[PDB]
Amino acid sequence: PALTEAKHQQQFFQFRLSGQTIEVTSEYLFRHSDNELLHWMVALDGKPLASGEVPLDVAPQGKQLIELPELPQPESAGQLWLTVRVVQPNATAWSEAGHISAWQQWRLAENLSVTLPAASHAIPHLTTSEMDFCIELGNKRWQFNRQSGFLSQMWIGDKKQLLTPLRDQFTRAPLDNDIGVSEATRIDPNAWVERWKAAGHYQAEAALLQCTADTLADAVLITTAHAWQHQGKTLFISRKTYRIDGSGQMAITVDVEVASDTPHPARIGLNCQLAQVAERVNWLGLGPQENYPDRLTAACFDRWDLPLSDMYTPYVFPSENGLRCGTRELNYGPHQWRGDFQFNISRYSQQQLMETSHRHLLHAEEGTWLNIDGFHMGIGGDDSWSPSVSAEFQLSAGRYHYQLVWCQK
Amino acid sequence: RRDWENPGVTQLNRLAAHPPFASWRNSEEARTDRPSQQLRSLNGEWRFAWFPAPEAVPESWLECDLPEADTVVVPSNWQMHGYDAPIYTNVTYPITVNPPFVPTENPTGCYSLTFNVDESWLQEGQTRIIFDGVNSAFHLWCNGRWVGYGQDSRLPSEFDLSAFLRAGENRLAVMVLRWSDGSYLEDQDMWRMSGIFRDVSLLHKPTTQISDFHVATRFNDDFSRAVLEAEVQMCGELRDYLRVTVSLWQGETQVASGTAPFGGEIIDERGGYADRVTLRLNVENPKLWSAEIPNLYRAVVELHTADGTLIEAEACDVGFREVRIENGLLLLNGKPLLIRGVNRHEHHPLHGQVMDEQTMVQDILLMKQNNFNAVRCSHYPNHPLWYTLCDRYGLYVVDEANIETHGMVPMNRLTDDPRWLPAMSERVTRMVQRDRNHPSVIIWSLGNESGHGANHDALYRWIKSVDPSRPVQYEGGGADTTATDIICPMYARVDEDQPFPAVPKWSIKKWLSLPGETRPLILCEYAHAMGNSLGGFAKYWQAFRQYPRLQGGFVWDWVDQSLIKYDENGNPWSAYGGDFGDTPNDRQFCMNGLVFADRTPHPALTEAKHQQQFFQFRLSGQTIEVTSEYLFRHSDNELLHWMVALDGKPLASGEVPLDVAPQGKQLIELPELPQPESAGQLWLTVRVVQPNATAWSEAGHISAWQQWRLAENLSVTLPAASHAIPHLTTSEMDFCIELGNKRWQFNRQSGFLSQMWIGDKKQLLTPLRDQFTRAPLDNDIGVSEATRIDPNAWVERWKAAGHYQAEAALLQCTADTLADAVLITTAHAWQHQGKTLFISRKTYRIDGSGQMAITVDVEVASDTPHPARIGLNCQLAQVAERVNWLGLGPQENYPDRLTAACFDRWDLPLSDMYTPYVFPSENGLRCGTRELNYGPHQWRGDFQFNISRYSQQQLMETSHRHLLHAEEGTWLNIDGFHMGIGGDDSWSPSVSAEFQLSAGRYHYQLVWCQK
Ligand SMILES: [Mg+2]
Ligand SMILES: [Mg+2]
Ligand SMILES: [Mg+2]
Ligand SMILES: [Mg+2]
Ligand SMILES: [Mg+2]
Ligand SMILES: [Mg+2]
Ligand code: NA
Ligand code: NA
Ligand code: NA
Ligand code: NA
Ligand code: NA
Ligand code: NA
Ligand code: NA
């Protein structure tokens, strides 16, 4: 996936936007843009609104101004995005006709949604028992275990949707850059993986602090709090609310505290093993290829749809892989998650990826592992033998908040 | 003739410039710098009359005092006495631009003085008068007879009165013009005043005398040996019996001496200077001068007959130091400097531009106490005592010619014109002739904001020929022209380029490496301290320390140029541009100081002190590494104090002596620290304390500090159960919740908490509502004016988008009863002309313990300009004496200006939570706060806040601090997020992107409870 990031940063055309004006500047020293045209497209949350093409005629080191036509207003809330691409209409000795050599995006107007949803046809019911809080709405049911404090099961009709409960996750199967030269036989205590190990990140267990249920006028509200500890120290505290309403949507709010003296965690998210396996993955976010916080410039915000296997990157030495960031909506099977998060989805658990040294030995687990992150650490790479993730990409804020809505589609 | 409309005549009959003389007739008085009977002060009471033009002055005045004259103190600026108004204009000239002419209405100040001269001064030798500063041009008469004329408001003009005086009573008449052709070279950004504003003195010299002397100090490779060379020139009776003896003293010990007859070496086909002599003294292991240790020797220059009669003696303090630029670096005594500088104008709120010793001393002490080591004389030579003080207290000085023609179009129109070369030359050459022997002067500057003209090139060269010991710098025309040895931009940013045509301001890091560039870079002005500013100051200091050729800079500027005015009641108040009827004017642009005009600090001063520290620290484990940034001294007056506290509660502390050599490091391993099982964050604070008093600081002065978070024990303890559940009562218009002695009322039409009762007392004067704006800072306004809006300024962008006038529309307001609480949920949209700018969703959960937890989630349209803050505000009913908080402090601190603040438990009087900036704006914020206590309230969370008796609306609507009035109750602003304040400059947006609130979605939470 990194090749596309290299292609984008090494583009030969730079762009700036000012109003309706796109300014293209050429970084060629010797040739004129004689095999290039600029294609532009404006979309609202992925839905195309307008597009066009303009021939490019820029001298080496010169600039060309291009005026976009009047931007008819859009009829719906959402963020309009402008994408432009440089296409070479003619084949050359090194590329085929249609080759895209550069691209850029900008956000244009956004119209926030202020429209009150609509009174629910029904009100979910809360069934309380010694060991669980169950919620029923129509043909759906959610089960919250009172001793663990997690959503342990969800059913559509009589079909269970989870293989493992939905739980917070603060670690990732280590990348080569997280490992560096550390070896079981010669630990480099300064490498990220060793700092995480030593701190107990991979061994920490959730301790329940609170699990309550309340009924509201049109919803049931589950509140939980957990502490993650290691050798008597609290590493992380996660407080959440699950609000399930008459519409069937479950709104999840997550507020996490990370002790200041623990090494900054690899991610702050949730994970689960879904019971089902589906053919495609469809999302509104950055893509289409794998992208991470410190490696997402080449990805574009749009609506993407790929076969599930394209959501896994087969690095020979397996590790955390396949994330997509900047995602506002994710669809898989009958499920939909909405929010502003990063995610990866595949048949391999983080546990397996970290326990396996060669891709050929991985085996698809039952169901699908979904990792949805409110925040994810950068992957670094300035070098692969010392910590190289820049400060601005480390999860050092101390307190983090994210929210998601899981609903059926 | 109208010599004041002719740049070809800048003086008539004026004597040559030279270094400070006193004509002692006893060498030990010269050695000790005691007063000289031959140098008298004429300061005191003079007679003065104001005229609207020189054509209105009556002839009788030359011969006798005008009955309607007033008696006034001299030196003074006549505007300070009320005769006419001072004018505050920044770039535009205060007069019509039509060189070399001035207004025919040109305020003329007629000063006179009747004084005594003893016969002895007249029996022999020469008696001269010296006017250290006359603004801007003047004619002088003595006993009714015309003596001469002078220009250049900032250097001394001396005239020989020998033939005009008589024993006994004599009368001077000085006709001072406010405007003259010299005004075209005096366009500096400051109040435009006039008068005899520096000292007036009378000096007696013998007929055969020392007419000039220059002292140089050259060294061997390691500074273990020096040669002091003093060239001495004489005027008068040249005879074989004359000699010069120069002796050098360290305290009462004479370290070297040389005697020689006059007659310098042959220099050309016609011979040599028979009226000059150069003495060379060898000095072993000289004690070197620097701003860190201002070691000085005293050189006494005796003119005498060989058989022993001292004719007269002159003398100066000598600082052995070498200044040189080598391999791209400016070095002092062979080591690279790091300039912690500030620009300082000569300004006093009551006396105008008149300087006095007390004030100078007060400024030098505070400068040093705040870790400055350098000062630039923006933008003219200073009163002579300033140099003496910087030589003795130790500050590096940039001495600057009085040449600024900013208002010309283009700016170099005069400086590139050979017809103005003579007037400019005098401003440069006479400054060097006067101040060349002061060790504190390390760099000469050619003036300011006069573009780049060939006159600058010629003059750069002149100084380099006459004084090879100091580099020459000059910013005009792009800061890296051929007229400067140092790249010395003003307001270039650290990482951000500003590619203006012809004179771009490159990022300073990028500027150093442009193709072919090799010079050191020291900003002549940076970090414009106007109003609530200095945002981003730390970014500069991190760059300076990281890049060797980035050698610092001079902050703009030390002191606000505000002037005192008196109201009807007779109470003083700080005034700025236009407050005297002056127009056009540049309003508050005259106030850009780190300190107020009466020397009280602005909060930005502590940020400069901290970033300019001389010791850097690193913590590893319980090992503290201290590194010294001093170049020449060991830390012989410093100890390190350390303290660990848990959320403000002191746990342990200690002190350790610091012994680090210059550029050295010391490791200090701290004791076994506590590990309380009790929740909270442990914080380590270290401070460097000087146990002994110095010439510039008191015993115990703190010179540096730093803090680090140590272990944190997050709280996992559950709160006990409440023997109580709040009750809800509803009506169409409100939701009321009651719990014991407490009550909360939420309005269903507005969707806000409109009142709360504790006991049965109302707690709010205005409801609790979201706030997205701030009363704009000077940096938010920049140059925008109602008459000439600058649409790119932050304030204008917010105004145009409707942030200040957006109204909350209620989208949802519900109340639910929980197991042990009542929950109120609301959502509001802020719109403007149909555009939704922000959406606020919150929950308020009131539980059986009486606490109210508020959760707020805001959405900000990505296309509206990033807002100033995202927070809540309310007017509380109570006024309490103190404010106590756990968070950054104790002074005002903003996101981009909080490095100096330390996290601890602070407790101050309410009034200290307001900063009285002259031009009112949002102020008093404290960031990183975890708990805030005021009266019976306590708010906990992770927020920034301000609290005072003044609403944001009032601050935005009032132009001057003395017009503000305390409102009923106390206004509290509690922000989840607050935009940086900026300050890289005050006339374009300068808040760095990482300090702009552009995330789109923001979340914050607070708990409001009692106690
Ligand atoms: Mg981009
Ligand atoms: Mg003249
Ligand atoms: Mg002697
Ligand atoms: Mg006599
Ligand atoms: Mg200027
Ligand atoms: Mg600090
Ligand atoms: Na083309
Ligand atoms: Na692996
Ligand atoms: Na440096
Ligand atoms: Na004006
Ligand atoms: Na100014
Ligand atoms: Na010491
Ligand atoms: Na104001």
From Swiss-Prot, chain A:
Residues of the full protein shown: 616 to 1024 of 1024
Family per record: Belongs to the glycosyl hydrolase 2 family.
Site (Important for ensuring that an appropriate proportion of lactose is converted to allolactose): W385
Source organism of the structure: Escherichia coli (strain K12)
UniProt binding sites for substrate: W385
Reported effect, G180A: It forces the apoenzyme to adopt the closed rather than the open conformation. Reduces the binding affinity
Quaternary organization: Homotetramer.
Protein name per UniProt: Beta-galactosidase
Name of the gene this protein is made from: lacZ
Induction: By allolactose.
